[PDB]
Design a protein around this ligand. Sequence first.
Ligand code: NAP
Ligand code: NAP
Ligand code: NAP
Ligand code: NAP
Ligand code: IZ9
Ligand code: IZ9
Ligand code: IZ9
Ligand code: IZ9
Lengths: 250, 251, 249, 250
Amino acid sequence: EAPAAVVTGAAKRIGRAIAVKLHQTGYRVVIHYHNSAEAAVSLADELNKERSNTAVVCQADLTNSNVLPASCEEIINSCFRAFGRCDVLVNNASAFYPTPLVGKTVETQVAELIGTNAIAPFLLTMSFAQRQSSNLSIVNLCDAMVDQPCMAFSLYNMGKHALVGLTQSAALELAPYGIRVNGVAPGVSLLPVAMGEEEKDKWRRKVPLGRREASAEQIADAVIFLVSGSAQYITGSIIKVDGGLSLVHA
Amino acid sequence: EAPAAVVTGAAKRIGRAIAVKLHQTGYRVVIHYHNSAEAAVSLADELNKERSNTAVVCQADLTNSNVLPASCEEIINSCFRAFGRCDVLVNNASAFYPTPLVQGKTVETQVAELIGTNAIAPFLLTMSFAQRQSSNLSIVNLCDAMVDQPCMAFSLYNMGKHALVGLTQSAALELAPYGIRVNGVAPGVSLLPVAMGEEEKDKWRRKVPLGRREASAEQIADAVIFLVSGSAQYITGSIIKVDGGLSLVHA
Amino acid sequence: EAPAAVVTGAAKRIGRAIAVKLHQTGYRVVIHYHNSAEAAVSLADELNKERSNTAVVCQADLTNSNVLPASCEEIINSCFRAFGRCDVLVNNASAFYPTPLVQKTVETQVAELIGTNAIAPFLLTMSFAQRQSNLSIVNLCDAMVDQPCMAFSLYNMGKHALVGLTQSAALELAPYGIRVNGVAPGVSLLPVAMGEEEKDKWRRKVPLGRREASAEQIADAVIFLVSGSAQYITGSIIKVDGGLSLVHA
Amino acid sequence: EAPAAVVTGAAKRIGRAIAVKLHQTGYRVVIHYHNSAEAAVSLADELNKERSNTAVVCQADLTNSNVLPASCEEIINSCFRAFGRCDVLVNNASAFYPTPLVQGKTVETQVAELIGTNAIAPFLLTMSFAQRQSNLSIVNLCDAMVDQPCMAFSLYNMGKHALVGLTQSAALELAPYGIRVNGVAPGVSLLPVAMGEEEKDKWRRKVPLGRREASAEQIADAVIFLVSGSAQYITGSIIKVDGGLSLVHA
Ligand SMILES: NC(=O)c1ccc[n+]([C@@H]2O[C@H](COP(=O)([O-])OP(=O)(O)OC[C@H]3O[C@@H](n4cnc5c(N)ncnc54)[C@H](OP(=O)(O)O)[C@@H]3O)[C@@H](O)[C@H]2O)c1
Ligand SMILES: NC(=O)c1ccc[n+]([C@@H]2O[C@H](COP(=O)([O-])OP(=O)(O)OC[C@H]3O[C@@H](n4cnc5c(N)ncnc54)[C@H](OP(=O)(O)O)[C@@H]3O)[C@@H](O)[C@H]2O)c1
Ligand SMILES: NC(=O)c1ccc[n+]([C@@H]2O[C@H](COP(=O)([O-])OP(=O)(O)OC[C@H]3O[C@@H](n4cnc5c(N)ncnc54)[C@H](OP(=O)(O)O)[C@@H]3O)[C@@H](O)[C@H]2O)c1
Ligand SMILES: NC(=O)c1ccc[n+]([C@@H]2O[C@H](COP(=O)([O-])OP(=O)(O)OC[C@H]3O[C@@H](n4cnc5c(N)ncnc54)[C@H](OP(=O)(O)O)[C@@H]3O)[C@@H](O)[C@H]2O)c1
Ligand SMILES: Cc1ccc(/C=C/c2[nH]c3nc(N)nc(N)c3c2C#N)cc1
Ligand SMILES: Cc1ccc(/C=C/c2[nH]c3nc(N)nc(N)c3c2C#N)cc1
Ligand SMILES: Cc1ccc(/C=C/c2[nH]c3nc(N)nc(N)c3c2C#N)cc1
Ligand SMILES: Cc1ccc(/C=C/c2[nH]c3nc(N)nc(N)c3c2C#N)cc1
């Protein structure tokens, strides 16, 4: 019987590439999404055309609120409902936008940025663990630039920092259950859809290795390694996939 | 005239020691507190006996909620109402307790308290502090030296302290144009919990290379004093461990 | 045609496992050794029995000295001689023993511990680059460098300098398409000299399974880093430590 | 009786600023120098005119060789000869120049100088200081940009990374003797005398806090903190004095 993985924010971009590779590797997948219903349903279609009954979608808002724990339990429950098991959790979904110190209220920005990047991963990790020849693991999508952050992204960066602490704390606490917890930290990969071509090229030219951003697939490759049998002694590790960008001084 | 500092969670233990040292240094102080009114007031009275009209108290819950931003604004405003200025913010207040991943407070409450006190409140206080701005303005965040070797079953606390490092770095960068420096002090084992058996306290003490003893509140306060001083005027985004070498000790 | 890899200190233990896995992946290998000629040759014999003329041995002391640069150049040269290319360098050879601050001369200890763990890797990295596809270097680091063993200052200094080399070389060689990464074991194969009871004390500390990494688990991370699956990865040091570095005192 | 300190490479620039500040705080000082005899003597004369018999010079090459241990022992002996004690060691002396990996001194001389001055001499001076033994401490001058290094400075960077390891190893090992071991990490402070103004300004413009390099005095201030009774629980800590430079991405 095939293992099963949940990938959050899997309709588009990096999450999608992660879901596709897991699926190509033999996993059944839960394609979590928030707003991208069309693209989620379309991906599950593609995947199920390749192997019947191997992909399902699951909608949820991962903003912090008093119902977030229920929503996160339900995401994990959805994997058990579809597939009878849950072997891998990929915490990929993420809000990302500036919150300068000097439309949304600051309460909402806190809820969204810290919820998606930190609190929801924690709650999903709880629910994953609670529900548990096995290779169980969690991969959190971190950020290679968290000690050299973008200007005016304090809430986002706080979330990704918290995500590092989660990675370490959960690796430690879940090791006795045979659950490994690790990270993959892109530098610049697929640039924001809203970002102009001038800015995108400014970022590309900063990367030592190729003067280009990572493909979604290059990020996915490292996720695939961490969940694989070739990483069974690896826990609490965060693998940069940044083409050297974090090594470059101002 | 004398500069002014806000210290959160200043009624007792480390926060108290910071407030006393800042006051001894010449600062007027806002003593923020949550539940410890009697201790906050007795500290304010002691300091005002020393120098009249140099200490006030300010009560607020720093749990995450819809009203936290207003509460944090009001804390900063209280320093301005009392003293006409606000030169230093010390983010010290902190909830601390285990939140195991596997099995009275609901988890959403534990999130609100642990992430709100250790991270979100610091961020909102930082905004408000900066929004209100020979000056020497700075922020000191009380971090945790053991953040990469955490206690078992303290994920939310540890997430909170990691977020606080992120804030220290993001705010140091963003506020540097305004002359506001943002730094941290990271205790390892300082004052142990009050009811903790001495025999348990000794297990921790024995781990500390430098003297097999916890740091006093005053030793922690000394590093805060340095960071706010004229001797640290090029220092920003730095987190100073005050841990007796504890974080260098392998399992 | 098949790529080629140089593995230092490859006759035994972790370097042997790295050599074997690279060979199994289709690499031709140079098996470097200092004192372990019999073991290096027996490994070569085994690999060459699988696939003829795909493994050679190369002797060198990697202690720092006036001749270390020339010896390093010759290690790289030996790979070009045997196989006509050098795609992969694994810096694995390492001296490891205590150097207490308060009481071999100390300068010999400096030469061995800093030479093997840092200077030879730097020299080999220069020679490898000077001669220059999926090119990469993997340096064998140490997950416990920030929580070091008591009385191992020079060893620790050397492993710290190797982190610095990994990062400086990743930056500098990126224009040549040469990636430079690290693998950091915690406790893997314990020293042969170490008493059994002492070995169990280390094993007990590891969160994930209360045991040491096999040499093959270390080798697995090396394989990933040299693979096409890691082509955007440079400057990265992957811990393979079963969570040991996360455990407080 | 006044405490005594050894400052390596103290004739000029940051090491002079450190010796001066320690002197102003009440220390007697050994001003170590290599080539800068005239400057070393000029400094010692100034300090001695402020307080008679409180400064001496001490010549030594700190390049690695088989006699470097003897030279480092002698630097510590010189402090005991002059002053009867040695309370503080400041490892400031440093060679600094590029060593490109792909293409003058031989490479082995570059290793001896860059690794010697930045790491091996500090290690040997630490052994000698400890062997000879209140508020005892060592402060190592590190480099805040060691994880975002300058292009073509691998050996220098290797040396500064080794120095971080010594700071940590020695803090652990010398704690039971009450010897604290810490570091101070400038980012951009006094630029090299051969750098032209335009190039200096390129560096200065990178610094978030004031668009300017640290003064020598600012570096010295952090040293003085770490040696003081205000840091008596601090050991194994490295204080960045970089005006935020290490936080600025490419
Ligand atoms: N792209 C990069 O260069 C880069 C760099 C560093 C780190 N990373 C990290 O790698 C991961 C993937 O990056 P990416 O650029 O592919 O991400 P992205 O497109 O910015 O976000 C991925 C998905 O997150 C989901 N999401 C956002 N807000 C949500 C909410 N409130 N509730 C539920 N889901 C929500 C969205 O789902 P819907 O579309 O379904 O609404 C979105 O498609 C992220 O964790 C990111 O922080 C990326
Ligand atoms: N003690 C240590 O060994 C140690 C180690 C590492 C880091 N640190 C850090 O150093 C700081 C000081 O430590 P400590 O042991 O002195 O702290 P503490 O005694 O545990 O807490 C300090 C104060 O935090 C305030 N606080 C708690 N929850 C709050 C809430 N919901 N809203 C508002 N205020 C709240 C409390 O105020 P009231 O009493 O007025 O309710 C309390 O007195 C903390 O940031 C801590 O994390 C300490
Ligand atoms: N084992 C662990 O738990 C562990 C933990 C952390 C890091 N590591 C790192 O992982 C790598 C492999 O570890 P290991 O335990 O397999 O190593 P090892 O058995 O200690 O040493 C590997 C080889 O290093 C070579 N070597 C030693 N001194 C040399 C010199 N002066 N010149 C040339 N070669 C020399 C030896 O080759 P000859 O036998 O041919 O003389 C030896 O067989 C090392 O870099 C180590 O520092 C290992
Ligand atoms: N300046 C900066 O922006 C900066 C940035 C990062 C870190 N730092 C660190 O802070 C410290 C002080 O910086 P700096 O710029 O003042 O240093 P510096 O002027 O470059 O060098 C200081 C002294 O090192 C001594 N030295 C050099 N090679 C030597 C050898 N072979 N033997 C003995 N002594 C030797 C020289 O003494 P003589 O003149 O007597 O020959 C020189 O005056 C250094 O450790 C440095 O790496 C500085
Ligand atoms: C210096 C620097 C600092 C931070 C970054 C972060 C990149 C980044 N993180 C993201 N997270 C989400 N959810 N979506 C994204 N599109 C990104 C993104 C980019 N680009 C990139 C560079
Ligand atoms: C391995 C290890 C990990 C974390 C610690 C942190 C101790 C600590 N943090 C605290 N925060 C608050 N708000 N109050 C406290 N009493 C502590 C505390 C202790 N004791 C100490 C040791
Ligand atoms: C707390 C801690 C600190 C350092 C270590 C290092 C382990 C280690 N490094 C080695 N290097 C070489 N060349 N050979 C080895 N046998 C080891 C080794 C072990 N065991 C392990 C644990
Ligand atoms: C991105 C970056 C990386 C490294 C630096 C280090 C500057 C630096 N280090 C030095 N060491 C010695 N012995 N002398 C110096 N003059 C420097 C120096 C400068 N400038 C500055 C910036």
